[PDB]
Amino acid sequence: SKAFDLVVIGAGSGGLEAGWNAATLYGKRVAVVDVQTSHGPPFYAALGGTCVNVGCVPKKLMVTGAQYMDHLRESAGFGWEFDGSSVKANWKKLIAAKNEAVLDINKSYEGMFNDTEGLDFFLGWGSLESKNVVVVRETADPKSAVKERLQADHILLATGSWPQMPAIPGIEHCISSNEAFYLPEPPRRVLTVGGGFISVEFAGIFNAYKPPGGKVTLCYRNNLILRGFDETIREEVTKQLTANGIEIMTNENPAKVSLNTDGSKHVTFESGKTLDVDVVMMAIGRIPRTNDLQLGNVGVKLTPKGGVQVDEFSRTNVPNIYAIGDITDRLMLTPVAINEGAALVDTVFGNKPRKTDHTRVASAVFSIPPIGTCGLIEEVAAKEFEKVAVYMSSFTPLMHNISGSKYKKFVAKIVTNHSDGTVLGVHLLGDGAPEIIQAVGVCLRLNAKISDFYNTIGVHPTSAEELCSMRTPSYYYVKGEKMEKLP
């Protein structure tokens, strides 16, 4: 049995920020628990967290690899010549390069623990035995062998989330993004189920690495993918994914999946339609990872949706027990979880309470082409403000008239409170949009107005300078209703 100021369950994005800051900035004694020291089967997430192991980091590398399908074709317009029929996409090489990069990060986190005073790592499954006791066991079974009993002044829950799987016959023949990262071969035919960023991103990945004759289908149960993003951009990215060979099935939802004699999957949709694919990847959502923590032992309250309930300072209903990151079922982003962890430790172990601002968080979708966005979409703005202006620019950049990818329209939209010009939201689609949007996030913390953008001198030639060239609204929302001109 061992004594700590802070025990962190989950060595992930938010958990490592909290642990490292508590130890090195405040001299505290810190224990951090995770179920695996490096990435992959059987538990997928590991030391480093979901983003590091089966998340942002590997998916970004694989999206980068998938973009070369466009680069190779588009180079022809600029005079590059080579034997197109000799081109092949080696998925095994991608996966191996990805595995080595992830493993390197796993190893560096190991050395971080070895090098840091007051920061100890424990392997296994952590759960709440008592208000000030964290137990570590061999497996997720609450009856497997105890390895450690850690007593804690403070406990931080940071176990992240997990893929949601629908309760349909044959769900066991489907995979999630976890398994997608380790497929031995690129699927020739794949259905990705869901309208959100994980489904969209992997559709683009599989589309580039599919073998000859392959086909990627994405299905989504409602009318338009990427709910919560700008509507113009949701429609455009639909169009540009279709232009690159991806079939988008909207208003369709799998009802059952069955095994074919050749190992492929027979999908039946609620509509009666059927589709045979090699892989069915469910990406319909991610849910807080709360079940193995034994929160009933101490009475941590959950919300109706299953997150650990927290106040703005990440405090549960139980004194000295905190929750940050995806387990709180708010914004499931790595930088938000990091911010939450650091604010928590500043509050608890320093003389300054800090709370994370969950508004105006910049984020991205690494679709091909990608999205960058910060702040409110226009229909959410229209419910909060009497007068909303939308400034819009949408064109194919000159380079893609030459590249041949004429479908690749760049979209830039600025949403303002039209009563005082305050920028409420900025939404981008096109090459570079994730990079363009970062300092827009800083602008929104200086209460930038549309005139601050338009009076800034552009950098030319760029996509980004579009943001500084919009003077006149394209249309408005007044009292929640969309109209081209003001009343």
Add this chain to the structure above:
Amino acid sequence: HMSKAFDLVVIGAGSGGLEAGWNAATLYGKRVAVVDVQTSHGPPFYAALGGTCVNVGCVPKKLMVTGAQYMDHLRESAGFGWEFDGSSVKANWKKLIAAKNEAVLDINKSYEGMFNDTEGLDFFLGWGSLESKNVVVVRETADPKSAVKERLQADHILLATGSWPQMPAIPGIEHCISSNEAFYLPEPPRRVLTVGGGFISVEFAGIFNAYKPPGGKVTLCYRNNLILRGFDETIREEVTKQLTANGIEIMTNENPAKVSLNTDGSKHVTFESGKTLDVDVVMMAIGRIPRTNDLQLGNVGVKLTPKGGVQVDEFSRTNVPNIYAIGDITDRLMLTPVAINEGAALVDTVFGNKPRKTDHTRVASAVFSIPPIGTCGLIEEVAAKEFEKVAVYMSSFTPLMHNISGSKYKKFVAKIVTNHSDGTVLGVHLLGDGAPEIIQAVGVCLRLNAKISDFYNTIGVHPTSAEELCSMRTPSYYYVKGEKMEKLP
């Protein structure tokens, strides 16, 4: 034939002149005349309707840099599993140049249709010069004895003729070219020397390096010790390494003394040091000078600066009350969006009853080197002269994707320079893929007087290069009364 009368006559239908002209006619209902020497791009006069950027500047060079980036893309794709017959790869420069020409000509034609269509915005073809305070003459050539095509009466006159490449007076200067001719080379040079340490020399070095035929070599020479004066010094050093790593030879402290022709027609360059280099093309890129010689400014008494640019006040006014100058002819910041801003501000002031002067500080700009630069505001050595305590926040690392691509030399550099007394960001300097796109909204931040804490409090977009700007809380080092030091005393 009668002379025509206008509220405003603009000499030079370029970045600044067109902005001024369009705004005066369409926003304020004025009658505008615009003069340029050529209706579409290329020889003999290179620049034309649309200006230097459109015809032989930012627009074509960006397309050509984009083409040159595919040499990196094709090679780096193998790290991500792409396989193809490397021996089959060819860079067809004629295709690149033909694609560039058609894009530029399309812009030319669209500008031509704007004039045919727009009330009070007229285009005149020829060489404009100042005859008197209120008369612009349009002649058939730059020679003031050439024939008069039009006389344009003008209440207000805008000088916006831009700039021109400077050629050094060395023996054999006639065997060399400028960026103008580089845009039309029938074939990519096997061996090329680009002379100059500035952005045009560096950008063209990258372009030629990607399209050079088999066994080719690109050499860049610079007469001082380190290229890209005016930019962040860490970035100057890093861009040198990464150009070198991609096969460009950088000769610093070297300067052509003379050029002669070998018996085979190639160029034999002798440097002041006595070193020699044989190349097929010598491209001079040592500077650009404001284009005033042909305006006959003596006729009305418009004052030039010692340097040679039209002298202006903050409102772009010359010493003659109704004659204004904007853009490269004022020999300050030679950037297309600055000229445009100046044009728009001038027209708002003169015709709009809304006075406004261009802010020449904290202008974001880019270098489309491979990899590219994005910058806004002060470099640290300049800031350390003006501020008692300067802090420098610095991140420099090879991004993970280039550990897989094999281009491990591609260190991304992000630097933030502050007034440490109050945290105000004085400058941001970036090197690496996406830097020109990242820096644009940084320009808005500095115009809003952002502090380092505004950057640090902003939550990162992950994984990006840009997020490094929002994760820097502790200075890497300082300047205290001009002195560099890791710590404050």
